[PDB]
Write a protein that binds this ligand. Structure first.
Ligand SMILES: CN[C@H](C(=O)Nc1cncc2ccccc12)c1ccc(Cl)c(Cl)c1
Ligand SMILES: CN[C@H](C(=O)Nc1cncc2ccccc12)c1ccc(Cl)c(Cl)c1
Lengths: 300, 305
């Protein structure tokens, strides 16, 4: 019993964190095999940030401009290339702690663990979701760029995010491990703003199922609803519309608790109209949307 | 920016998790040097648990009854002894991944990271607080016993908790790494209940400072209060009393934000009597009490491990 926001054990990712320094900029790098991945903005100065030509700046760099440090050992950069917004530094030593890994691009609503690092040293691990507006609500300070988001499948680390920047509202933007940004963001100091964020409806529903599995039932009702009637109410509360894919994904939890998806949807509709009336669900006074259906099944 | 419930990196602890099997029971063990620590109830069956004489049960066990597995390698148990509610299995091989470590007993209000394990395999990490009633509001399924709680201080792991059981309300009880239970709990299948829990006041204050550091400041007011007036109001809302030690510990945060502790106490006093008025603090509608003052400083300053 119990329900917690739970991150994956970060050990397999800690053994990959290194420090990458280019000139006056120091950030984190992900050392996998003989390659160190890091945000390409490490090659930027003060002048080339509003409108940098990364292809031009990288052509001017030599292997000896990059200083890579893994623990108390300096790694030798023998090559450099750019893949989208990620810089790839070939090194003359393969990481002996390289776990089994994949690079995966996730969709909004998906969750992952973040290993926040500073100077190649892991400082904390927390759980995040890719917001529908493609930002993440992380906890990051200056020097955290290059910190990675990941999930663990048995023994395999799926790297899904690399931290690049903080937007003016305090939310964070980054890329997958192939350097493609999540969202309409660019690694330029140009005026950027996250779109209005919305609630991940399928995740709220999965969390309501987790609460039922844990013995919370006060929010349940005898109503059901149509998917269309639910979406029309949900959207007035800035909730994402629920698709037939989401209803199918909630199937196992529905079978486990004996509460049909559209029956749980009607309970969600009531919570939105009423509020919690001084009550909590799983120790929370707000509806939690950072637990996917797969997270709930895994944890329960 | 941002404020998250954040656990310590669990890597140094993952390299110590092993599987301990005794008869039909399989749980987790903590392998440090040539010793594997695990809950002493691993030697019990369902019948033994009702009224267990652990000293008598352990005397009947031989080293070969314990099956220890580190990854897919079996460790050979060359000795066994009991220290309070923890069983210590001497093995022939010292853990090469043994980090710098200490065994520490924590106080209520203190926080720590839990590496939840099943069959000696780490499955998740989360941050939690030792409640004033000495339970932890964890997330544990069957097989999680032997999962450990820890903090990291520089490059030293301080092991502070080992999971033993789940109480009828769904909250959890365990011991320090010397086998002494936190709280008035016993490792026997008997009627047990956690005492009425209270809020960790010093932690709520630290979290209010974290919110101010993050720009969330609607709850601040012009008022201050005496420590005595604050504690009289706090006592009525099931909040732990705030001591002069707590006021001193909140000092650096008071200096950083420009909000004196008793000034923040007057904000908390109003929040308790009037509520949040439909507003949130750090995206939460409840006052969060599982971040210590040190956790807030560490997170809002980027200390690494
Ligand atoms: C110097 N790196 C920053 C950046 O946002 N860096 C940070 C990352 N995370 C949190 C931070 C909190 C406070 C201050 C900086 C933080 C930056 C600025 C603009 C662009 Cl376009 C890019 Cl790619 C990067
Ligand atoms: C076999 N260990 C169980 C126990 O409570 N085991 C669990 C520990 N954590 C979470 C659980 C969730 C669901 C089911 C079991 C869980 C047990 C029973 C009574 C006593 Cl007195 C003791 Cl010491 C141990």
């Amino acid at each position: 019993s119990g329900f917690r926001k739970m991150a994956f054990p970060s050990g397999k990712v800690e053994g990959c964190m290194v420090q990458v320094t280019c000139g006056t900029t120091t950030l984190n790098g992900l050392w996998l095999d003989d390659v160190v991945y890091c945000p390409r903005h490490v090659i930027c100065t003060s002048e080339d940030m509003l409108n940098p030509n990364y292809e031009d700046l990288l052509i001017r760099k030599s292997n000896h401009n990059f200083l890579v440090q893994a623990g108390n050992v300096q790694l030798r950069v023998i090559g450099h290339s750019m893949q989208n917004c990620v810089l790839k530094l070939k090194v003359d030593t393969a990481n002996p702690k390289t776990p089994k890994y994949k690079f995966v691009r996730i969709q909004p609503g998906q969750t992952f663990s973040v290993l926040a690092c500073y100077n190649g040293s892991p400082s904390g691990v927390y759980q995040c979701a890719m917001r529908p507006n493609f930002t993440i609500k992380g906890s990051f300070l200056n020097g955290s760029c290059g910190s990675v988001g990941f999930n663990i499948d048995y023994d395999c680390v799926s790297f899904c995010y690399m931290h690049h920047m903080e937007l003016p509202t305090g939310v964070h933007a980054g890329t997958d491990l192939e350097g493609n940004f999540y969202g309409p963001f660019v690694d330029r100091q140009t005026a950027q703003a996250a779109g209005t964020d919305t609630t991940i409806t399928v995740n709220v529903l999965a969390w309501l199922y987790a609460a039922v599995i844990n013995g919370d039932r006060w929010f349940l009702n005898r109503f059901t609803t149509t998917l269309n009637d639910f979406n029309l109410v949900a959207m007035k509360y800035n909730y994402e519309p629920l698709t037939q894919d989401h209803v199918d994904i909630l199937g196992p939890l529905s079978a486990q608790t004996g509460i049909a998806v559209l029956d749980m949807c009607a309970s969600l509709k009531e919570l939105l109209q009423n509020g919690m009336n001084g009550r909590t669900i799983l120790g929370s006074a707000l509806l939690e949307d950072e637990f996917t259906p797969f997270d709930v099944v895994r944890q329960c």
